[PDB]
From a paper:
For the apo nsp12-nsp7-nsp8 complex, we vitrified the sample in the presence of the detergent DDM. The structure of the apo RdRp complex contains one nsp12, one nsp7, and two nsp8 proteins, with an overall arrangement resembling those seen in SARS-CoV and the recently solved structure of SARS-CoV-2 (15, 23). Our structure, which differs from the SARS-CoV RdRp structure but is similar to the recent SARS-CoV-2 RdRp structure, reveals that nsp12 also contains an N-terminal β hairpin (residues 31 to 50) and an extended nidovirus RdRp-associated nucleotidyl-transferase domain (NiRAN; residues 115 to 250) with seven helices and three β strands. After the NiRAN domain is an interface domain (residues 251 to 365), composed of three helices and five β strands, that is connected to the RdRp domain (residues 366 to 920). The nsp12 RdRp domain displays the canonical cupped right-handed configuration, with the finger subdomain (residues 397 to 581 and 621 to 679) forming a closed circle with the thumb subdomain (residues 819 to 920). The closed conformation is stabilized by the binding of nsp7 and nsp8, with one nsp8 molecule sitting atop the finger subdomain and interacting with the interface domain. The closed conformation of nsp12 is further stabilized by the nsp7-nsp8 heterodimer, which is packed against the thumb-finger interface. In addition, we were able to assign two zinc ions in the conserved metal binding motifs composed of H295-C301-C306-C310 and C487-H642-C645-C646, which are also observed in the SARS-CoV RdRp structure. These zinc ions likely function as conserved structural components in maintaining the integrity of the RdRp architecture. Outside of these changes, the apo nsp12 and the RNA complex nsp12 are very similar, with a root mean square deviation of 0.52 Å for all Cα atoms across the whole protein.
Author numbering:
A (entry chain B): 78 to 191
B (entry chain D): 85 to 169, 176 to 189
C (entry chain A): 31 to 50, 84 to 100, 117 to 895, 911 to 929, 932
D (entry chain C): 2 to 64
Write the structure that this text describes.
Amino acid sequence: DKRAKVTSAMQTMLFTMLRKLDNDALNNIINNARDGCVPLNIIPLTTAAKLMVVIPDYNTYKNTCDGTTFTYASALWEIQQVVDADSKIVQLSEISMDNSPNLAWPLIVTALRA
Amino acid sequence: SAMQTMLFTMLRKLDNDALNNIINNARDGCVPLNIIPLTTAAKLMVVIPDYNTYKNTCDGTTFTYASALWEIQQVVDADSKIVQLNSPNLAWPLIVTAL
Amino acid sequence: VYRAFDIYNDKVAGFAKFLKETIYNLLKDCPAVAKHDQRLTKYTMADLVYALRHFDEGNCDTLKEILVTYNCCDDDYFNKKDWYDFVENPDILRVYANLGERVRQALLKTVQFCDAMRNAGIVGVLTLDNQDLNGNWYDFGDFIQTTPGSGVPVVDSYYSLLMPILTLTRALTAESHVDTDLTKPYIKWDLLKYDFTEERLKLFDRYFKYWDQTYHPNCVNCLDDRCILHCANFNVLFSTVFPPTSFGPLVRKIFVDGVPFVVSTGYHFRELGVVHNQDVNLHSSRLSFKELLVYAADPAMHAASGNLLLDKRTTCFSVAALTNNVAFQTVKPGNFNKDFYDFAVSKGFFKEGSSVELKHFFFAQDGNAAISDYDYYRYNLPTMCDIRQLLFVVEVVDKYFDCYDGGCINANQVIVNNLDKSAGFPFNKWGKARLYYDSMSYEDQDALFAYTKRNVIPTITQMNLKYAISAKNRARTVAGVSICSTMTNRQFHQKLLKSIAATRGATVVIGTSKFYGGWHNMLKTVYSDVENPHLMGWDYPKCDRAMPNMLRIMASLVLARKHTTCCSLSHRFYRLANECAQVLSEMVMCGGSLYVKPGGTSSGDATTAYANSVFNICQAVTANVNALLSTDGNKIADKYVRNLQHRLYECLYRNRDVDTDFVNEFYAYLRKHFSMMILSDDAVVCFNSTYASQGLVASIKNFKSVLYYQNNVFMSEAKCWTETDLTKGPHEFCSQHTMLVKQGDDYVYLPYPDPSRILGAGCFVDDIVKTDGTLMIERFVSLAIDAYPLTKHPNQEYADVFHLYLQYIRKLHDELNTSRYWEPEFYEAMYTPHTQ
Amino acid sequence: KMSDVKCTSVVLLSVLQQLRVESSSKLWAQCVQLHNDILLAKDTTEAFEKMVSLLSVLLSMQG
Ligand SMILES: [Zn+2]
Ligand SMILES: [Zn+2]
């Protein structure tokens, strides 16, 4: 019975995806509201330990990811990695006005919460 | 496979000068390294072997390719230094990039 | 010289353009009252509402003047062509928004003015005409004094007519700032706050205190579908001042044998308010199949284990990025069949100057296509509709659907077709819908349906790119919704949908084949005894992108009126709420991440075509209503339609309960003078041209104005067609043309397609055919069946397409009676009305 | 004389995709841009002029 296979897959997915769930910000953000009921659109914004920005062109990068640290979601993020849209590592020194046409946009900027 | 033989068969049939002149020039080894600009006169790196009938390529510092005329401003060969034109003491690739 | 008035006497009624005591001694203390004798402006609020409700270019001089005078924009702005569109140059929205505060301040004056009257004991009716664009009031003509402190005002027509332009000019924007001021920072709302019910009621009492009917901030407390539409219409306006992060599913931590999950136990709809589930267990153990299916489908687990995402490519609200890497999907160019092209050129096709060419191609898209196409939801805006008008139209439309039967059905008696469809995320990881339909048992399906009858289950739909032919450059995405939605929607709607698709002769022609005389019978049904008839058809720009939320809920509420004996109002309400969360504003899995849909229609939803049919009928009825109500009553000579217009206005803005006899009368009037044939979004009408030439039925400019003020799009004359000579069939219906031919000793109508499309689909294939020689010949028989009518066309080149195709089937049969498909007669009998 | 141009452009882009040009981003972007640009060509000279560019993209590689 393939029903066993599919339910096993569902259980495995749920259990494996619970590991990365509890960050101890969840419990201090749920008990901070009556009824323990919060919108789902705030759990990643105040609980996730990682940030991803998809930068389409340079003019957005110069306004968002200034330096190695930027401010977003009323928090400070430090740039951990920049990767072009070919899964190729990119150094922050290459991203300049003159070199920008050589870059393969968009760029995925992975940042950490600190 | 089975697509190149279905591609060049038609390619010969369109009978376009701007196409056959590119294929035979690239047949013996004189291929480009980038795309040819339709507008804005962008650079195009064309590599030519050691005197691959250079007379059929340039005439009086004027490049002919794809039935189009290009004005040469800079030439760099495999020695990374601009060479002027005896013949045997050269390298194989000659980039005659023009704008 | 002309001015807009809202007139209601016992002789003439309507909102239309026309020519041209001691009461003031008891209202001068009010600050909203203009000083009589003075200091009044040129245009009134009626002129604004008229210009923004009945809009066409060339004659929109007043709207242009209004904007320039109130400093919204300069004189130079109207020189750029195509400013008024909402798709091209969306910046016009900003211009409209500069009217917003002037439309809010006015409202305040109204709440003040009525407060004077109830203090002075005055009974009367307030109309948009007596108010100045600055907000003041005047023209104390129809007021009558009574005992002081008992004065009562009438604001039904005023508020109802003004409702559509309250969201167009975003008037309540100043309610988002602190102290309600335009020069102060935004209100720093709490991030864990989602109720806003008291704020909703504060907004109601601040702006619509004297609105007589009761408003339910949470539509779960509502009484019937009409009350649901009312309070949801008000919630649409009030939800645009609250933080966008406060909507979507509400989550709570449960424990299952110790381990805590974060699950959805509610939902905050911008239209339906706050809804809370009813079967909630904070402690569980050994989850069965149903709970697994629900818990892996809601966005609760995915948005919590995923990373925060900021996507600067779109402007749509983004939630989370489900994968470390961002996915870019490309669609490949279509494979090309050399044999058919060689055969066609060997027979003289594709020569210079020919009428038939190649214009349909498998266009190729780069990796930036899916998100670029998904960013087209910026055309879906929060639109508030006139409540009285829409409440009459939802009663007129149900007459068009009172011929079918509905009812919620059991799991065993469900017919499934082509079970191999994307089961949505994350159900497409382990197979298609077929696996799930063979795993779950019947009682599991029934229990899941009952669960959705008492709880809200938000789901995630996946957006992919389609591999299809077209003559346009666009991307043509595909939305695949979760099977936890399809199962329940099928169980809810299949019996009604099969009834709509099985009756012939109705206005909705969904599910009727054009073979065996179907086209001819459908056309003759469209004609059906209309005097002086012309034909006309229109187009819906960005139909599935800009379709409002009120219209989609109204379409769901109309399609749900068949459930009067199988489920109660709360059960019908929870079904409606499940639908809105599941297919209207759920979370989309684009790339490797999740976004939110501001609305629109899911192309992959099995209840789509019928919902667009309801929306098309609603727009038609609205067009006739606004055409009949914008006509000068005096200039109408007929004594029947003038009384019809009188009772129409009286039933919209003066009568509360539905007047059934007028519903039947007006439905019969439309049927007699304006006949329709409706398929999902393509529509044809046969209309009495003499009436339409004097404003008794809907022209095409009425459709233009209705779409402008109610659908937030612009419809142009290029795709709208009219026909004054009826012997030629309709110009365009469902990518088919119609021609009148002589066969079988009489005349018939046959449909024929564009031969360019047929040739393009013959040259280029989906690559799912090149390996096998049977699917190829089947496809060629399909296009030969579609192309057979071209033999009867006057043009010889058009006629030769069929001969080319038939010889091609003949060759493919050689290379490898009514059953044989290579002789022509097999295709002739396809179009004779004798028989499948 | 214009149908066969738009007809061989299709197999050109097909073989370019088969050569894993799609793996790169800035190459596939311009390839599809000019291919879709000439699928709307209404003058044959432009179609040939951009057919030159696509054939060059084929010939710039040694595979
Ligand atoms: Zn209510
Ligand atoms: Zn029911």
